[PDB]
Amino acid sequence: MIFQQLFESSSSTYTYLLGCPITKTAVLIDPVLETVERDISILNALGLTLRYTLETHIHADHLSGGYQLRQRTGCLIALPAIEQLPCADIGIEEGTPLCVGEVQIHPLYTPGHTSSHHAYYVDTGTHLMLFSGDALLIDACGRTDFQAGNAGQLYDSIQHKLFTLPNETLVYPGHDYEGRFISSIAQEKQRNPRLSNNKSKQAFIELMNGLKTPNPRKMAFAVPSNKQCGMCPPN
Amino acid sequence: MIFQQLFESSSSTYTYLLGCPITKTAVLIDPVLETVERDISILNALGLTLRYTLETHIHADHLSGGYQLRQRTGCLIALPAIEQLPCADIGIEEGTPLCVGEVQIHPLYTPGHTSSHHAYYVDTGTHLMLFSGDALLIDACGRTDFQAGNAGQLYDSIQHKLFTLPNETLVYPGHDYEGRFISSIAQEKQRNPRLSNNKSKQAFIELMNGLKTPNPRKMAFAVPSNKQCGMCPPN
Ligand SMILES: [Fe+3]
Ligand SMILES: [Fe+3]
């Protein structure tokens, strides 16, 4: 399977390109507006046709490239069904794969950063690849102080959906602010400072309430724009 | 491919189990004497026959489990041909793969931690997996203060053989002391404090000469025992 991990420096977002060599089709996971041209150039170099874009959640920190990408390529936009967004073409749910050629992408419902957040995993035959979005991050996790942030729920999602995955599962996060690209489930259970040493839910909730971070400066218009699949506002 | 990453806490070594699901045969990379029982129980639980043990180098910090494993399974011991060790069955060299069923293991000569150090890589179809031994480590690299320690040579080895692999290449290290399990070539180029920022060779050597770390406890008898494939001394 073709695989590329792409970084967007303004928002520190990872976009994941997955491609099927047999059918020459591809899906972009969490594409960013700022790097629409870069993603199209890479797809053209590899001779892949963009068949789906795929969001893990409704981002507050950047605008989704999905609207632009669908204009320029005619791909279908896929994102969580529970959001009931008219502009989306495909509604993702746990239990129903998204098939890009011979690649199967399995959603996992992981709320708590947002209420409709999904992670995705792919079996390569040797590794499970976990695109964990903002649910589990490398040595951290998604912030829970947004409106629909729910730390107790995020803890459940990580414990039940992600830490029940085998030790060698690769963790590909939605963001990183420190130059890290990859982890594994065993590594996060061993040393993630927010979840290691069988930290209890109560201790996790207190830890996550004790974080004080400036909100993403885009938050005002990114969330409504991303509810429109990345379509800019008139303002 | 069956893949497991196994930790041995006393020396902080990673042993890697690779298995062919079709022929039911396996290899262990850097098996440790203290965990021979564990490795054999795991092999049996997976219904695998151990065909080869494979060392990255002559270890100074632990005794290889290769000798005992061969006694107990009848496997063959493979290690770098340049060491010319009579107890070994197979001489490893760059350019000649080690074949375990349908799994192909490719050596890369990467001296500088020792003069015979080899890394190994495997292609899963989606990832290149780099077993880097003590050449490249996560956010560090192997110590260069042993007798055949050669910092300038290690730098060449990492730059020419490892940093030229593709970005998404997985880095499975020989050791880790901070609970990390995995990295990528892109991550290490990006943020490894010893090698990032196009750090110069002279700067890398100055840094390595400034590190002061204690010698591994077992070093006096581990190196001579591993030249006998992990057979203990009488005394
Ligand atoms: Fe987010
Ligand atoms: Fe070593």
UniProtKB/TrEMBL annotation, chains A, B:
Entry keyword set: Hydrolase, Metal-binding
One GO-annotated biological process of the protein: hydrogen sulfide metabolic process
GO molecular function, a single term: metal ion binding
Record bears the keyword Metal-binding: yes
Limits of the Metallo-beta-lactamase domain: 12-175
Disulfide bonds: C87-C229
Protein name, per record: MBL fold metallo-hydrolase
Domain of life of the source: Bacteria
Species the sequence originates in: Beggiatoa leptomitoformis
Lineage: Bacteria, Pseudomonadati, Pseudomonadota, Gammaproteobacteria, Thiotrichales
PANTHER family registered for this protein in UniProt: PERSULFIDE DIOXYGENASE ETHE1 (PTHR43084), PERSULFIDE DIOXYGENASE ETHE1, MITOCHONDRIAL (PTHR43084:SF1)
Binding site for Fe(3+): H57, H113, D134
